[PDB]
Every structure is written in C-alpha cells, then in structure tokens.
Amino acid sequence: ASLPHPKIVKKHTKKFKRHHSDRYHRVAENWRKQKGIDSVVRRRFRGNISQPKIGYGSNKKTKFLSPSGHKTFLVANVKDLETLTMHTKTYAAEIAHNISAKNRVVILARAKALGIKVTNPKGRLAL
C-alpha cells in the first residue's frame, strides 16, 4: 500500500561504535570521535574502525523511510491519528509507548477504519 519509491540502499548498515567500547565497560558504544594525538582511529590507519562522515548520508528520496516505504509518525490519540488521513501512502502511525491498551484499541479501530498503517499493532494486547 506504500507509495512507489526507489530501492532503499544503506551506505553503511553497521553501527558506528566508539573505539575500545569492546575493551572497557566504562567506555560506552555511543560514537565519540577520538581527539587524541596518536590515535590510529583518528589517523585512519588500515584495519581500524570506520568513522561517520557525510559521504555515508542516505539518499534524500529514501531518507527517513521504513522498509515498507513510509515515514513513521508517533501518535498518542485519535486526533493525532487523523492528521494522517490524506497521507496514508507516505506516513505510518506508531503508537507511543505510554499509551494504555484501552486507548490502543480505539486508535487501532480508527486506523483500520481510515486505512492508516500502524507499525506497532501489538502493544499491550491480551489473548
């Protein structure tokens, strides 16, 4: 049901991790640039980790798109849901994490009435 789009290609699907996040526990794997003077990562020696740069930027025609082909949009209620009434082929609803189940059923009912795609239609449901 998505809009036609080019083939989504990611120039670097692997996550950029901070140097020595595997070595030390205090060093998290969120990316920080090595500002050291002897750093092989900063000097870009062969066989070391790659650094994020603008050449890895995604195509603007396929940026922010899910593999389904839409852009996700966080919703908390049906009034936020109804903004996507005319844009079902470009946007996909995403029910926020702090929505109760008795409201999630209402959002899901309105979304299946309006033809809007929900990308988490399994939150807090019972069976």
Binding site: P4, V75, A76, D80, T83, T90
Partner: protein
C-alpha cells in the same frame, strides 16, 4: 501531542514516467542456428540430449523435438542461449510447423490455494508430435548412425576441452 507535525506533507499523486525510447527490434540469431540443425541441450530436464531444431518462435525461443520416438524429447521450446549448434544438419522440408506458436504452449496457470500436498497430456500435442516425427525419421534414415547419435546423450570426458572442441 507526541510528535508535533510536519509543516508540509509530500503529495500522494504518483507521477507518470517519461515517454521511453526503447523500440523492440527482432532478434538476430547466431549464424549456426539454421532450421534442421542438431543441437545439444546444455541445461534443463533433457540436458545432454541431442535434438533437431525446427523453427525460430516469436519470443526468441527455438522450437525443437527429439524426435520423441528416438530419445523421448517431445515437441518443446527452449532458449537459444542454452544450446550448442552442432554442424550435423538434417533437412526439415516436409513438415508443416506453422501450426505451433507461443499460445500452443500454455501452462494454464495455477491458483495459490492449490498447493500440491502429495501429487494429463493433450491428445493434440501427442498427435502433433506423431505427425512431425514420422516425417523427420524418413530423413533420418538416409544418413547412417544418425538415429543412434540422437538417441545417445552427450557428456564431457576426461581431457575434453570445449574451447578446442568442434561441434
């Protein structure tokens, strides 16, 4: 609200493609594929079998037969890219092959619900095969050993270099 809004939404009307400029000229077959040539089937269910070539069909396929009495290859269509044109030539004047075309070979496509859990032939197709092969075998009987040649399969032996082999 959780997310605010986009200030402008992308329009949903899909654009039209440009008027392309790719005409479809007919296929130019290679010089060794003349009607009546013995080909060697390189792939498929009947791989390694020698079959006579009859007619260049519409969708760039070659209409062949075994004959079916000889090696069990029925009237069939193959791809010209997956055969080897052996220089052994038989003359196929005397057959009315103009009956067959792409709609003669129809699969009668299967629905998705019909899944083969565990597990027929056209009388027209078997009689057409019987019509063509009885005219083909009269020409096959002229030169010696051609029937046995078509019945035997082709295979590469130890020391056979296909870049030096002549067919």
């Amino acid at each position: 609200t959780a997310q605010q809004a986009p200030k402008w939404y992308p329009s949903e009307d899909v654009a039209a493609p440009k008027k392309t400029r790719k005409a479809v000229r007919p296929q130019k077959l290679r010089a060794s594929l003349v009607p009546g040539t013995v080909l060697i089937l390189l792939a498929g269910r009947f791989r390694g079998k020698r079959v006579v070539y009859l007619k260049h069909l519409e969708d760039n396929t070659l209409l062949v037969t075994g004959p079916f009495k000889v090696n069990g290859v029925p009237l069939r269509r193959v791809n010209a890219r997956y055969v080897i044109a052996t220089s052994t030539k038989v003359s196929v004047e005397g057959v009315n092959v103009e009956k067959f075309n792409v709609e003669y070979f129809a699969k009668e496509k299967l629905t998705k619900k019909e899944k083969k859990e565990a597990n027929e032939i056209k009388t027209e197709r078997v009689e057409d095969q019987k019509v063509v092969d009885k005219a083909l075998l009269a020409e096959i009987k002229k030169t010696p050993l051609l029937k046995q040649y078509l019945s035997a399969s082709f295979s590469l032996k130890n020391g056979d270099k296909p870049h030096l082999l002549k067919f």
